[PDB]
């Protein structure tokens, strides 16, 4: 089924705050913000978390844009392979969703990878949601365009068991 990290990591405090630090020229301005407005909304309606955008550096979750060697000492493997982390809920680099530019970044509509839907994935991560032996989960290792939508009881189940 689903998996959590060891000592069943979360936030402590139910709002969230993520700061965009930059964009691909991939995607508008607009669709970016649209496309993480979004995945945060998928989680929402399922958790005490509320998701507030914030234009600060001090924020819960911090989003962005790396080709290679970046900030977290990480470095992304060009095209494809990796395509984004992210790292459990806690301080500084915890709770922070990093994608990697080299990937083609859409809606999907089969031109590459939907910047939502892989968001949705690194957001689960965020939150403290671990990969899951469900093939059909949302935060299994596989990703495909929409069969969506996106949510599943597995992931349902592994955020219900953290926070509500
Ligand atoms: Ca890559
Ligand atoms: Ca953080
Ligand atoms: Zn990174
Ligand atoms: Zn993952």
Same mark, same amino acid.
């Given at each position: 089924?689903?998996?959590?990290?060891?000592?069943?990591?979360?936030?402590?405090?139910?709002?969230?705050?993520?700061?965009?630090?930059? /964009?691909?020229?991939? =995607?508008?301005?607009?669709?970016?913000?649209?496309?993480?407005?979004?995945?945060?909304?998928?989680?929402?309606?399922?958790?005490?978390?509320?998701?507030?955008?914030? /234009?600060?550096?001090?924020?819960?979750?911090?989003?962005?844009?790396?080709?290679?060697?970046? $900030?977290?000492?990480?470095?992304?493997?060009?095209?494809? $392979?990796?395509?984004?982390?992210?790292?459990?809920?806690?301080?500084?680099?915890?709770?922070?969703?990093?994608?990697?530019?080299?990937?083609?970044?859409? =809606?999907?509509?089969?031109?590459?990878?939907?910047?939502? +839907?892989?968001?949705?994935?690194?957001?689960?991560?965020?939150?403290?949601?671990?990969?899951?032996?469900?093939?059909?989960? +949302?935060?299994?290792?596989?990703?495909?365009?929409?069969?969506?939508?996106?949510?599943?009881?597995?992931?349902?189940?592994?955020?219900?068991? +953290? /926070?509500?």
């Amino acid at each position: 089924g689903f998996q959590t990290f060891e000592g069943d990591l979360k936030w402590h405090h139910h709002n969230i705050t993520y700061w965009i630090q930059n /964009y691909s020229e991939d =995607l508008p301005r607009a669709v970016i913000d649209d496309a993480f407005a979004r995945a945060f909304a998928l989680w929402s309606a399922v958790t005490p978390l509320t998701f507030t955008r914030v /234009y600060s550096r001090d924020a819960d979750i911090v989003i962005q844009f790396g080709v290679a060697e970046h $900030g977290d000492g990480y470095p992304f493997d060009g095209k494809d $392979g990796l395509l984004a982390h992210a790292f459990p809920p806690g301080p500084g680099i915890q709770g922070d969703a990093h994608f990697d530019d080299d990937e083609l970044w859409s =809606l999907g509509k089969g031109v590459g990878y939907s910047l939502f +839907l892989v968001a949705a994935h690194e957001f689960g991560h965020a939150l403290g949601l671990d990969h899951s032996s469900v093939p059909e989960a +949302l935060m299994y290792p596989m990703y495909r365009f929409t069969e969506g939508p996106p949510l599943h009881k597995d992931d349902v189940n592994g955020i219900r068991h +953290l /926070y509500g």
